[PDB]
């Protein structure tokens, strides 16, 4: 099989800057009938790959000029000569000289903006989850830049690391921010025992602590 | 022209399934269709492809035994069938035309594991007022979420699920202003389709 290496592995980039991305095959692309079977696609979060480029360098319906495809042999580029936040995602390089056809590891293109602080939300648990004897406490700790942050959770002066499940969203094209939701799961009992819940962001925008809290007795 | 793909699908170990692809009228009788596999948080496979008029395929090695590559001329759909399923045949399944179009994929879990139905809890808080959609207690992958029907989507930020421990939990935040709430109605609306489950929850203060 035909190994598509691609590089750089990840690329962060201000919006107006150009980007390049290589691919190179471990075989010439260049097949028995004189074409070159190289196409370009780009994941966008949450969506199936769409192609971009097609025979190393023709540009697909609807893609935006900015984009250019070029190449021979066993070396591939990509280039978008001014960035904007749409472009971010996973790019791939796809080859069809070659059985079976393969696709490069990818190229996360990430979009630079202004480091931006989260927004906390705390939320007990609802009545209805109490009624059915469960004790979940949500935290949103929404569009923040850059993406590292710490969520950790206090009870009653404590840390809680059990019942904890985290989920982070890609960059969002629409302001070129990161979101992310913790969970603190205890049982309706274990809830009922306790009062003080915080949840804490630790972020590079402050120094130090982003807290919400609210105490289950109010 | 685009290619919509069959529903999600939960299918028990050993046994098979069969997905569709199909495109408007023109293109599919003409170009070549891709069948491509991707798993959660990773690259892309290669399965095969089928042409169009001759009905003539071509396979990767590591699916020779797997998958079935079959075309309908007369309603312009392509299929693939999977066979003798195993945990490691659980990933979105695409189809991709050589002519450019991509389907939207179609998700497909291999599990022994039990349909639960999500229980679906209003987040009600403690210039902008955050407020949020809880969504515990579901199986398989995926649901669906939008907020007052669809009136609401601009300030949403709708989270990806973790699986903790049977079993399947996700959450969604939307932040409207002071103003717009609680003083105008807004309400959940989930979906899940193995089930057969619409629940609709109204965040109330
Ligand atoms: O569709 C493919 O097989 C393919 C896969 C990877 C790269 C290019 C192609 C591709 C072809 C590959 C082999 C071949 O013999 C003919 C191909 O024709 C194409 C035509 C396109 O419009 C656009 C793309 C192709």
């Known amino acids: 099989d035909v190994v598509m290496t691609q590089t750089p592995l990840t690329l962060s980039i201000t919006i107006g800057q150009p980007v390049s991305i290589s691919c190179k095959s471990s075989?010439?692309?260049?097949?028995?009938?004189?074409?070159?079977?190289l196409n370009w696609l780009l994941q966008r979060p949450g969506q199936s790959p769409e192609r971009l480029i097609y025979l190393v360098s023709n540009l697909d319906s609807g893609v935006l000029d900015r984009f250019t495809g070029s190449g021979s042999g066993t070396d591939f580029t990509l280039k978008i000569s001014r960035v904007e936040a749409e472009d971010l995602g996973v790019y791939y390089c796809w080859q069809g000289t070659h059985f079976p056809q393969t696709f490069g590891g990818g190229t996360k293109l990430e979009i630079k903006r202004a480091d931006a602080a989260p927004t906390v939300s705390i939320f007990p648990p609802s009545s209805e989850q109490l009624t059915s004897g469960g004790a979940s406490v949500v935290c949103f700790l929404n569009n923040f830049y850059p993406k590292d942050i710490n969520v950790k959770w206090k009870i009653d002066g404590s840390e809680r690391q059990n019942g904890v499940l985290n989920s982070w969203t890609d960059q969002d094209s629409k302001d070129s921010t990161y979101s992310m939701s913790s969970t603190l799961t205890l049982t309706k009992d274990e809830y009922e025992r306790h009062n003080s819940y915080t949840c804490e962001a630790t972020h590079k925008t402050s120094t130090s602590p982003i807290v919400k809290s609210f105490n289950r007795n109010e | 022209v685009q290619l919509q793909q069959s529903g999600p699908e939960l299918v028990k170990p050993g046994a098979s399934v069969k997905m569709s692809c199909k495109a408007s009228g023109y293109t599919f009788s003409t170009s070549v269709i891709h069948w491509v596999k991707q798993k959660p948080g990773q690259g892309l496979e290669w399965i095969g492809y089928i042409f169009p008029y001759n009905y003539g395929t071509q396979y990767n090695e590591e699916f020779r035994g797997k998958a079935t590559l079959t075309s309908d001329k007369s309603s312009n759909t392509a299929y693939m069938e999977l066979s003798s399923l195993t945990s490691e045949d659980s990933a979105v399944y695409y189809c991709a035309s050589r002519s450019g179009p991509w389907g939207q994929g179609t998700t497909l879990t291999v599990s022994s594991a039990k349909t639960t139905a999500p229980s679906v809890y209003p987040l009600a808080p403690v210039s902008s007022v955050t407020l949020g959609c809880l969504v515990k207690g579901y199986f398989p992958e995926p649901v669906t979420l939008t907020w007052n029907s669809g009136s609401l989507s601009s300030g949403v930020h709708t989270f990806p699920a973790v699986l903790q421990s049977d079993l399947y939990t996700l959450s969604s935040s939307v932040t409207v202003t002071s103003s717009t709430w609680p003083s105008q109605s807004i309400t959940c609306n989930v979906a899940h389709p193995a089930s057969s489950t619409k629940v609709d929850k109204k965040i109330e203060p």
């Open positions: 075989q010439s692309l260049f097949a028995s009938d004189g074409r070159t079977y």
